[PDB]
Symmetry: D2
Subunit: 123 residues, 4 copies
């Protein structure tokens, strides 16, 4: 169980900062600050994680959401990251993500970006 491992400040390859607390129950709460896109300052995030992972060297599944609205901007969009926490000398959170924009029904086909972020405790 990785409540301790997860909780803290994480940085991705784009220079984004994800600050999270992991609850005993499975909760994830925090703030996200994106280095790119139509974003400034911190945005609320929430999510979930597996509080009793397999003990066989598997990763810890988890995910979280950011809606890109805060007191400064509203980018009419939401990203969800789905992935796994891997512990040990160089801990990582390896994710894939889906960003959906609010669109008209005619432009729905082009509503959703897909990418992959890797989070580390350093840089």
């Amino acid at each position: 169980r990785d409540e301790a491992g997860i909780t803290g400040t994480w940085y991705n390859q784009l220079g984004s900062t994800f600050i999270v607390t992991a609850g005993a129950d499975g909760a994830l709460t925090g703030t996200y600050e994106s280095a790119v896109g139509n974003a400034e300052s911190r945005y609320v995030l929430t999510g979930r994680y597996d509080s009793a992972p397999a003990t066989d060297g598997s990763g810890t599944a988890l995910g979280w959401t950011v809606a890109w609205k805060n007191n400064y901007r509203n980018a009419h969009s939401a990203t969800t990251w789905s992935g796994q926490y891997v512990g040990g000398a160089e801990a990582r959170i390896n994710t894939q993500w889906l960003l959906t924009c609010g669109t008209t029904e005619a432009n729905a086909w082009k509503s959703t970006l897909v990418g992959h972020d890797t989070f580390t405790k350093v840089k």
Copy 2:
């Protein structure tokens, strides 16, 4: 603003049930019960949504996460749905989703499923 529109009980094409409350602030809280997979009964969900969408007929971006652990099972996985709420006579939540399993670093390549769920207020 679709706090009212979102809040409630939603059903997808697989026969799953998503029960959600949308907060004034952007919060989503609730429970998910999957008709398929390594799942039984209700699982906690949390997420976010755009509480002040565009007024130009665009959808309302949102997302949420379920970690597949509850008092009955632990499937060592998490799904995130990213999508948009569309209001009006036949309201829908149109999503794409990422399901990550906890895996060894050797099997990480096969950790993540992708699909699409459409939620309605009826069936």
Copy 3:
């Protein structure tokens, strides 16, 4: 084996037309005309399919690519559809797709759209 089942003219939910020949060997060749986006007229497509599927009622895996350049336009992008052919009274090709735009390394994070198309022999 669905060489016969696949070959022909298919229409998706956006009103696009996919014309394909399936070879005995696994080849797919054809043309795609998109109802949406930065596209006009026909574009070359190529792909592959499983020429000896399982006989247990499973679908037939397949995929194909379109690069969005032809004599009329160049949208500096490529879509790949991955999915399965399901035969029988109402045959379908159920796909998920990835559209990558050519971008600068700074905008790479926003290079890739994800969606889902369902192809039928009618409409």
Copy 4:
């Protein structure tokens, strides 16, 4: 135009080998050998690429498909990679991919894996 840049032997982070020829017209033809999964030896691949990319430092969009059937195995599946070729001292092909298995209509929800491969000319 990157006919020359693309053509050749490429290696990904899993230790897979992708051997490709790029045609003047936009064609990609070749063979793929996977380091992982239900695969052995070479499999046919085909695809497309943008033969006249933007000259503004953008990448070259492209994609390709492998159906996982050859003389040795049939894994009743197909992968499509969608991405972009980036040229220059350390050329890369940055991809995201969708792997669809042939499934029953009941298991269709779990038919499709998503991941990301980065290809280089060395290792």
